[PDB]
């Protein structure tokens, strides 16, 4: 994708060159000064763009992290509080496991059911897969885990607190994820700055050919392609949750995700 | 903005027939002084377009919250009282209430149709006696909270833990306020529009000594790459204003009351 | 100030005696391209960037305090209503406690006297002790956490719900240091200082350097980047003083007020 | 200024330039303008960046003094609120709270606590406090007993012993919040090396420049050297807010003010 | 030797390179101007400025993680002095976990062998059993909130005050959560790869652009644009990795020691 657009502006030098002769004849002459101008001006806006982009990677990993950490220390508050109730232990963390699959499987727009039926109950996986939100319903369940034990008293109502906060925790991470994926800054104004970068790479062998002549294609293809590396990476780091070779390892995090909650509850991957 | 284009092409037609009789008169126009302004011009409408994109992150960040507190504030009352069914559908009326009154709030739009879908024409009235509609209709789902308190139904430490949801939403509320009367650069943003337009409409003049019958096309793509990039700073500075793009809070509010339904079983619809 | 208006006609008096005095340029051997005023020119848009950014960021901390203060308000008299919908005797005295800390923060932040509205407020006993305070602000505050306090000590309030209340008046806290800090903390002098020299002395050395390229457009174009460099230096001056009282300012009487019908509006008996 | 030492020396430089170049041919040397714009806008750039950066040091520095105050403040009004009556406690926390300030600045200055201490304190506290290698941790500690203690009196119950618990956690994360900015600098390449490469670009830029300019040099380039060079040294001050020069932090008017609070009127309340 | 000085050294013989052969450009035809590779330079310092920015901030972010393990720990070693002053024996326990903590976190980041110190600092069936994890840094936080869980079970800690030390443990996660979230996610290759690539290739062929308007003068302004340019790239490179072993990089070993000398500061020892 990056090599066709790299190729094509070769080619359009070329173009630029053997079309050179003509120039003084068809009545038309392009300096380089008014290409700096707007190619510093593209430049600028690619890199308060791209900047933006890496800070939308960086909370979409961000969020992840939390998934480890609040489903880690929610085990952990389990464990220290109700060491004994290892029937509620291996429940609430069928669920947590399951939120995190179910996460990946909502943010790249895929089924969960597979996932699902291997960790949960059937009666269960119906419930889930019948809601709007299936991680919404999940955290709902696991909360009924912990509020159960509070209404047989094995907890308090501060113990229960205590836990709460920790499936308050994930349903900010889902919120937060939620508003990642539904966030393209509007549909239009990404496909206008890269048809700005893709019209002035292909204008510029025209308007560098007088200066250059024959090298023309030698230093249009290197800021050509200096441009595009720039615009096409700040693409991938805007959809983090996409399958793209520069963004987030879902399917990884998940696995570590299980492995640890497994690791914590006496059990073996 | 395809107008403003369009005045760029007749005002370099313009340039171009008219480049004979000015310059020989002793008035000239190099591209190295147009250069500097709008390298200049760049640079503030990058910082100005950073400003902008986070008050739109912030917007979006105070919604999402919205969605966030709702969905564990429903989540806490059929934990915490499951038995409790005529309070959670109470409590979720005023929660969906809350998410379109805030809506309607923002856009300048009349609630009214919402509000009478969603409750009882008493507090229907009692919201929109109020100044702060958005507020009383909190205050309202408090006094449900409050209710099953004085009950002996939440204890004082789980009557707490929805207080802070509240709380959270308060947040909201305020946060949004402050993003819709608003700006806080207090209509230079005029100025520096204006600013973009002049240089623009005097660009072809500057150009045509350098480029002839080639300035239209070069004078339009600039044109374009500027005031593009002013165009999108505008629409991020105002996330709330009457001329924004209405589908992401429409469909917020539209997910949040679907999930809310959905966790008091009222979908889906019984066998 | 709109020195800009100034400024930019002295621009055109630069121009006119660059127009003028021209020819007496290679006589003398003094040559100005502009080259080396695009340098510079950049050099200067850059920081006035990142200074107008400091400038912003400083203006919508100053815009969200105020926020927090009607919003911690607000859930702290609905709290008090939820909790104790009773007490109106208490709802009463903590409100007029809460109206009291946002005028008396106006008036701190902007150096005027508060005595007419404590006095609009409260007993003239709690406005003999607020004004006695070398913090008078800070001091409402201990009296509305007295107020709370009471409630605690009468059985009406538990610890869980005492605390709950407490957090309120913690942000109010939050508040009140953050407008101090702002208040006293400005953008450093030394930015404000640099810039202002450079940018003007910019905008008159600019008509020198580009008579040479521009013989009679000269005053035209000069004007246009002046204009330019002093509406984004002039941004800055217009964001830097968010609790005075110009135009530009934050309408600190109207929240003020917004602040008090707020808290009337959720008591009333209803 | 350091600066009005190195820009005469710019001055100096820029003589040689106007002296020189006829002699250019002769010795082989032609200079244009341009790759000097190329050089001087990334400098500029990097210089707008680190600027930046040292600002962010400056403020997060600042806020965290903030918070001293704000925390300080409301660990008194909630003793003041929650044990009206406990002066002797009021004073003895106060007094730490206080220690804790003086301490810090010392901490972070360099300089010696026990002038301060001796002030505030007892003796075998101050000796108990000055045994540490850790002073600011050690008044937090004691600090901490002191409520610790209401608690075992059963004078306060485990709820309202959390609020304020909670208030000297907000403190122990300023100390660390500090400590980072103070132990960590930014990286000494950071400085070092940006240096170096503005006040060479700024020798080297009149040779450059007289081509263009002939006689105008010495004003031109001292007017770029100024723009560059306080910039860098602006940076340079705001790095290390905890040091002493002009931009810095006034952490002795600081304490004061924090001081000046907690003992406000005898320490006495309504 | 020290890749800076050797990079510069090409640039110096690129430069002859480019003045003996600047005969052969009229010929061959090959015109290079300065116009273009300042709209490039400038677009690469945009970048490099934008890239540098998040390199700094990574690192500043990695230095806050590891604050936050001293303020965490000193105040909960503090609590437990508060709350329970005469359980010197759960004191020492927990300050032992607390500084294992510390130092299995560096040995964690810094990929080495955690033995030497948790056996210093621990009993021999603990330190088998964390190193027997595959999480051992999450498997201490585990004890540690054991002995906290046991101390409420006693009922030497109330629901309330367990609560208040059980906070500090979730601060000590994050950070868990937080550096291996570092350690495993770097800033994207291709920032590296991509500008790498284009400041090297630049700084190569700008000799050959500056030496028809510069002459002999070219190898002096080129290695000085260079020297820029590197150097900056540079710093972005030793910024990015902060739990390296570089002297650049955070003193990781200091701060354990910090922490260590710290809390045995505060129990009395
Ligand atoms: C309400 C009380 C706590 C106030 C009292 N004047 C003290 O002292
Ligand atoms: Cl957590
Ligand atoms: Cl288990
Ligand atoms: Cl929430
Ligand atoms: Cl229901
Ligand atoms: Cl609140
Ligand atoms: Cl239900
Ligand atoms: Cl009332
Ligand atoms: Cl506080
Ligand atoms: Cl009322
Ligand atoms: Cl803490
Ligand atoms: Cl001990
Ligand atoms: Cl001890
Ligand atoms: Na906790
Ligand atoms: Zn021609
Ligand atoms: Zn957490
Ligand atoms: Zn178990
Ligand atoms: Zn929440
Ligand atoms: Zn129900
Ligand atoms: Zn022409
Ligand atoms: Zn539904
Ligand atoms: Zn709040
Ligand atoms: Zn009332
Ligand atoms: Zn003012
Ligand atoms: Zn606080
Ligand atoms: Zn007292
Ligand atoms: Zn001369
Ligand atoms: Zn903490
Ligand atoms: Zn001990
Ligand atoms: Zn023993
Ligand atoms: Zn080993």
């Given at each position: 994708?990056?090599?066709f657009?790299?190729?094509?502006?070769?080619?359009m030098?070329?173009?630029?060159?053997?079309?050179?002769?003509?120039?003084?004849?068809?009545?038309?002459?392009?300096?380089?000064?008014?290409?700096?101008?707007?190619?510093?001006?593209?430049?600028i806006?690619?890199?308060?763009?791209?900047?933006?982009?890496?800070?939308?990677?960086?909370?979409?990993?961000?969020?992840?992290?939390?998934?480890?950490?609040?489903?880690?220390?929610?085990?952990?508050?389990?464990?220290n509080?109700?060491?004994?109730?290892?029937?509620?232990?291996?429940?609430?963390?069928?669920?947590?496991?399951?939120?995190?699959?179910?996460?990946?499987?909502?943010?790249?727009?895929?089924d969960?059911?597979?996932?699902?039926?291997?960790l949960?109950?059937?009666?269960?996986?119906?419930?889930?897969?019948?809601?709007?939100?299936?991680?919404?319903?999940?955290?709902?369940?696991?909360?009924?885990?912990?509020?159960?034990?509070?209404?047989?008293?094995?907890?308090?109502?501060?113990?229960?607190?205590?836990?709460?906060?920790?499936?308050?925790?994930?349903?900010?991470?889902?919120?937060?994820?939620?508003?990642?994926?539904?966030?393209?800054?509007?549909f239009?104004?990404?496909?206008?700055?890269?048809?700005?970068?893709?019209?002035?790479?292909?204008?510029?062998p025209?308007?560098?050919?007088?200066?250059?002549?024959?090298?023309?294609?030698?230093?249009?293809?290197?800021?050509?392609?200096?441009?595009?590396?720039?615009?096409?990476?700040?693409?991938?780091?805007?959809?983090?949750?996409?399958?793209?070779?520069?963004?987030?390892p879902?399917?990884?995090?998940?696995?570590?995700?299980?492995?640890n909650?497994?690791?914590?509850?006496?059990?073996?991957?």
């Amino acid at each position: 994708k990056i090599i066709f657009r790299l190729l094509l502006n070769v080619l359009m030098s070329i173009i630029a060159i053997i079309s050179y002769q003509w120039y003084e004849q068809l009545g038309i002459h392009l300096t380089v000064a008014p290409f700096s101008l707007l190619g510093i001006a593209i430049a600028i806006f690619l890199g308060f763009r791209n900047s933006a982009s890496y800070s939308r990677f960086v909370e979409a990993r961000n969020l992840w992290g939390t998934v480890l950490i609040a489903e880690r220390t929610l085990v952990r508050q389990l464990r220290n509080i109700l060491p004994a109730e290892h029937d509620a232990h291996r429940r609430i963390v069928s669920y947590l496991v399951a939120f995190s699959w179910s996460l990946k499987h909502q943010l790249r727009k895929t089924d969960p059911t597979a996932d699902l039926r291997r960790l949960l109950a059937e009666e269960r996986v119906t419930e889930i897969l019948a809601s709007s939100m299936p991680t919404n319903r999940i955290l709902l369940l696991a909360g009924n885990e912990i509020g159960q034990l509070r209404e047989a008293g094995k907890l308090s109502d501060i113990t229960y607190g205590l836990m709460d906060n920790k499936l308050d925790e994930l349903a900010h991470v889902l919120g937060g994820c939620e508003r990642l994926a539904t966030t393209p800054v509007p549909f239009a104004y990404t496909l206008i700055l890269q048809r700005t970068v893709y019209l002035f790479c292909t204008l510029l062998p025209f308007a560098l050919v007088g200066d250059l002549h024959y090298m023309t294609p030698f230093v249009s293809v290197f800021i050509s392609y200096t441009f595009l590396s720039w615009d096409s990476l700040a693409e991938e780091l805007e959809d983090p949750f996409g399958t793209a070779a520069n963004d987030l390892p879902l399917n990884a995090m998940c696995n570590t995700i299980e492995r640890n909650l497994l690791d914590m509850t006496g059990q073996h991957p």
